[PDB]
């Protein structure tokens, strides 16, 4: 569905993202805002034939299988369709893989461009967590 800011912060916290690999919860909330506008069903097609799926716009060249990304991997071991659920469990679990893969949150270029270097704790301000 389309989360509200504080709603998503609480859900991400329940699913273990607050400080996962050293990134505080506002980083994840800011990344979801700028990757998908909090929308679990967002998709975006890329010039390379891959597509970004779901709330954290996880990409089919590396991380999920969509059957239409030629030459791609599936390092989260999941169909990309699983990442378009209104329940964030699969997206969070795959994001945990991605952020642990040695490049931090730089995997999310909307995060790198629009969140990193800003006061990301503001994204959880006033939320009841």
Q: Which residues are annotated as a binding site?
A: 101
Q: From CA 87, how far away is CA 108, in angstroms rounded?
A: 20
Report the residue from 26, 40, 58, 91 that binds Cl ion according to the rule CB under 5 A.
Answer: 26
The distance of closest approach from Cβ of residue 62 to Na ion in the complex, given in angstroms and rounded to an integer, is: 7
**Collapsed DSSP state (helix, strand, coil) of residue 118:** strand
The distance of closest approach from Cβ of residue 21 to Cl ion in the complex, given in angstroms and rounded to an integer, is: 14
Count residues binding Na ion (CB under 5 A).
5
Q: From CA 109, how far away is CA 106, in angstroms rounded?
A: 6
Residues 15-74 binding Na ion (CB under 5 A) are 60, 65, 69, 72, 74
**Catalytic site includes residue 7:** no
The distance of closest approach from Cβ of residue 121 to Cl ion in the complex, given in angstroms and rounded to an integer, is: 4
What is the DSSP annotation of 27-53?
HHHHHHHHHHTTBTT-EEE-TTS-EEE
Residues 44-103 binding Cl ion (CB under 5 A) are 51, 60, 66-69, 72, 79-81, 90, 93
| Other residues' Cβ atoms within 10 Å of the Cβ of residue 97 | 15
**Collapsed DSSP state (helix, strand, coil) of residue 19:** coil
Q: From CA 71, how far away is CA 101, in angstroms rounded?
A: 20
Chain residues binding Na ion by CB under 5 A are 60, 65, 69, 72, 74
Chain residues binding Cl ion by CB under 5 A are 24-26, 51, 60, 66-69, 72, 79-81, 90, 93, 121
């Amino acid at each position: 569905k389309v989360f509200g800011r504080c709603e998503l912060a609480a859900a991400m916290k329940r699913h273990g993202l607050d400080n996962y690999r050293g990134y505080s919860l506002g980083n994840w909330v800011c990344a979801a805002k700028f990757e998908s506008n909090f929308n679990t069903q967002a998709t975006n097609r890329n010039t390379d034939g891959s597509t970004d799926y779901g709330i954290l716009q996880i990409n089919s060249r590396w991380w999920c299988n969509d059957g239409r990304t030629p030459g791609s991997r599936n390092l989260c071991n999941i169909p990309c369709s699983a990442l378009l659920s209104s329940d964030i469990t699969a997206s969070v679990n795959c994001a945990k893989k991605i952020v642990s893969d040695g490049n931090g949150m730089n995997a999310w270029v909307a995060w790198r461009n629009r969140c990193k270097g800003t006061d990301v704790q503001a994204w959880i301000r006033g939320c009841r967590l």
